[PDB]
Design a protein around this ligand. Sequence first.
Ligand SMILES: [Zn+2]
Lengths: 111, 173, 49, 241, 99, 94, 91, 181, 59
Amino acid sequence: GPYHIKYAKNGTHLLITGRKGHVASMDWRKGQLRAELFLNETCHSATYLQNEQYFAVAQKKYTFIYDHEGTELHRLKQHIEARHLDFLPYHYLLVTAGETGWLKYHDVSTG
Amino acid sequence: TRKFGLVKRTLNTKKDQRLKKNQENTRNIPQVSSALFFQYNQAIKPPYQVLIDTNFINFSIQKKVDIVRGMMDCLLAKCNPLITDCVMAELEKLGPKYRIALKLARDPRIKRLSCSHKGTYADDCLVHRVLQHKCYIVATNDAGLKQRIRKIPGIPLMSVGGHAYVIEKLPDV
Amino acid sequence: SRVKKRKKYQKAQKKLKSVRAVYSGGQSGVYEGEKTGIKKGLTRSVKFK
Amino acid sequence: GARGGAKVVIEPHRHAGVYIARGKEDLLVTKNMAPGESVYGEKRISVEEPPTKVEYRVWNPFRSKLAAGIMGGLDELFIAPGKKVLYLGAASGTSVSHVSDVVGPEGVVYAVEFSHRPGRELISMAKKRPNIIPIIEDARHPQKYRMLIGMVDCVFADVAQPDQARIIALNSHMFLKDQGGVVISIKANCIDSTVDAETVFAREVQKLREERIKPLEQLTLEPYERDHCIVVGRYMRSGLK
Amino acid sequence: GLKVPKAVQKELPFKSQIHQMKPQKKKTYMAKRAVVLGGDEKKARSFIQKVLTISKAKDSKRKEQKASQRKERLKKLAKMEEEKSQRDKEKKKEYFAQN
Amino acid sequence: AKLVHDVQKKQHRERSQLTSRSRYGFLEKHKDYVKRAQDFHRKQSTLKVLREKAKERNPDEYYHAMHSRKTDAKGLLISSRHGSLSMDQVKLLK
Amino acid sequence: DDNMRREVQRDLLLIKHRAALDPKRHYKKQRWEVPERFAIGTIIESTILETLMGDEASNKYFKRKYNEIQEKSTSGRKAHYKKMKEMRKKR
Amino acid sequence: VRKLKHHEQKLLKKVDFLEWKQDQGHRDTQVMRTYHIQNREDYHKYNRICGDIRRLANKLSLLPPTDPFRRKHEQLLLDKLYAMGVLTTKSKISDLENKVTVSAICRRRLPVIMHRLKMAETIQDAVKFIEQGHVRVGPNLINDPAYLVTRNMEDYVTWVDNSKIKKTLLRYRNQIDDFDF
Amino acid sequence: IKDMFSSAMEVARFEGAQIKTVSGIRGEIKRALSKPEGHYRAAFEDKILMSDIVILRSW
Ligand SMILES: [Zn+2]
């Protein structure tokens, strides 16, 4: 702990990210664990992308995009020290802000 | 019991199906035609069927050689010249400059052959027809096309040279 | 000269049989099967492109 | 060669419903729909299977042009188990019975014949084979027997007529399914004996394209037949290009 | 056949150590138990090892026939290649002489 | 063969071992000697490789199969001819 | 069945190598790996191995041909080597 | 995503949820897999060192070719990198750009050198033995699978005395002496 | 080698001479052996057999 929680837009899935680096994605109604990462790192926040298939985690210095089963897809080298994450569902933009005081918009579809 | 040599799960580019490059991934020996005795085409006989190439019509006009009469003179037999849709399409694409050649190509004596392929490239269409059936004479002056037909055995090759037509691979002459 | 051309032609007839199948009058007597065997995985048809 | 007491090994052919009998000689065989009798005096092979006694009939290439096609190595044969086949020019059970074996109980064979004398044995055979529907009618007028035929996956034509191309086109349009099969037996002499065989074959292929049938492959039936070829095509209503 | 010295064979790496089975001298129980069908089976077992002897020899001779005609062909082949190489050179002098 | 008579291309017959030396055996010719030299060089080539493999062996090389494989007293690998029977198996066989 | 009856096994082995059964047949060149499914049967109108060895012409052919191969295979071998080392001995 | 239809593909040409340009082709993941790197950022720490070498070489190249300073430093860099084992050859100065790579540095890690010395059947096996305390370099036990071994120190890579692996090596050849153990 | 020469005195005259076998293996007359008379030592480019015959070409 402590644990930051972000529900899916339709409320079917729960994404949890512990400060010490325990990240889990689960369907809380049926109690099925879609993915569980034990990153030995400091995780600040996480968010779901367009749907439960992909989610993003803001780790010590870089943001990582993960798959439904927990497979790492991308390491966002451009986003540095991000502490807050948000996803604009209609625009497919991922937004980050942190200690750098830089607001970065990233298109998940085209990358 | 934690396992040894633990690694972070990551996308495997070479073995992941979802990626496009990974996603994508009875012998036939054609019979030699029964109409062909080694290099000699025994089956072919008069009246002959001749496929007209686009360049052939242009040169025939240049030398004042009529298509039907010139064919009868060269082979001393009745010839049924045939123009495929490709050759007709090539003539039309040539432009207003070659309107004379288009008019002669539409002569009623020149019979028409339909085509069932998308492209308009006529060199490939002619070569496919001769390979399947050994019953056509190829009338062309294109250097490239003539070499292709020469490699195919038993395909008489006709050309316009000098003042009249010339037939190369037709033993009965 | 006539004899040499005679032997040359009959020689060529033997070679033509190895190049392609040639009709030889058809069936003679009871059908005794494909003597040289049947090849399941070989096709000799000419395919249209 | 293939005498009575000899023993053979039966293995499947590349085409479904066709088998090979190995030995000192190889024989093309088909499983017998009506075991215990031969329709035209062919040899038969019996296997004890756990025990029921299954039988296989020898397919003679010199008698059936379709068998000559299999021997010559046709790449695609639309005749297969559980398919409806419209057989035109079914003189008798020399070839229809073997086709009935390939389609099997689930499939059907619409045997079409015009002459009444061969038709009578076609009726006699068909009562042994429940999957055969004999239609004693001219193939020139498919509208007469439209009541009797539904859609057919493949059309096989062995009619020896000069205008068979018209006969094939009419039957295909009425009864052949889109993307369905067409298998034609062409005899050069019947169509036009004035010109060479190759000119006839090239001319017939052109007619098939005009009638929206795409030819897939061509095969000559030597040494089993002279001046004979089989053209295999697909009925592409939408477009041949 | 080559016989490796035992001194060398002893100090060989794990991957390349020659496997040499020793002969057995004491009669094994299974060797004393196994039944060999005699009479009719003997005649039907000598027949097969004769047939497989002919078939291996025939293949090894027809295979050697190809290897003899491969050598003859490639000698004829290279001669045609040499003619096409020299004559191709000559054409490229005749052409560029114009240019 | 251009400008060569058939007389020029006449076979030259091969000589044989002397009777006094018949005991020693067949008189080797050049083709026979080539068979000897080629065979000896082939064997010596493989032997030379084996010695280098022996010299360059790493004493610390470890393979999981070392447990299954065994070595004789002399130091040579022992290989099972076919690759013990439990009593229950023996009772049935007997 | 996995039993693979010895009569059946020899018959299939006698079809894989059928080119050597008669010096006048000379079949097409094929490999014929044993099929997964097959059914042995007789012709309606004595196994092949039993049928073939009942012949006298075929048996006399194999014995001659087999013997000729043995002469080739045992030429220059240990038996030939020992004779030359014995010729060097006086008697 | 489901396979896009034709009209969808034309309107979504640049859509790719698994490959992005900033990934640089997943070169990091490929190199991590080949040499079994367990720390995600080890590649990019190596990448920065490679860039430092390449930056210096580029600046050196822009000095005049006959400069004594240029020749001295370029040889020193070639001398040092060869000693570490990153560079196989010292002959060509262009190697500082073309043949300086993360794989070259990763190839000198302890698990890989064990694999090349045949102490392990695979790099993964070598990592396990290091994590299990079977491997020493000189007199020091090393359980870190990221230790870079210079050319000189590759001579001292060996098993620990009381390792069960050593017993199997000696027991297999029947050369085990229990006095030592 | 033996039977080429009758006495060691003759061999000394031909010491260093070029010789060969029927197989084509080239050699040299190195030295004359003291016992028996006429025997001599030769070195060949490759090992020769007992069945081989050595020849010295002279005119
Ligand atoms: Zn066309």
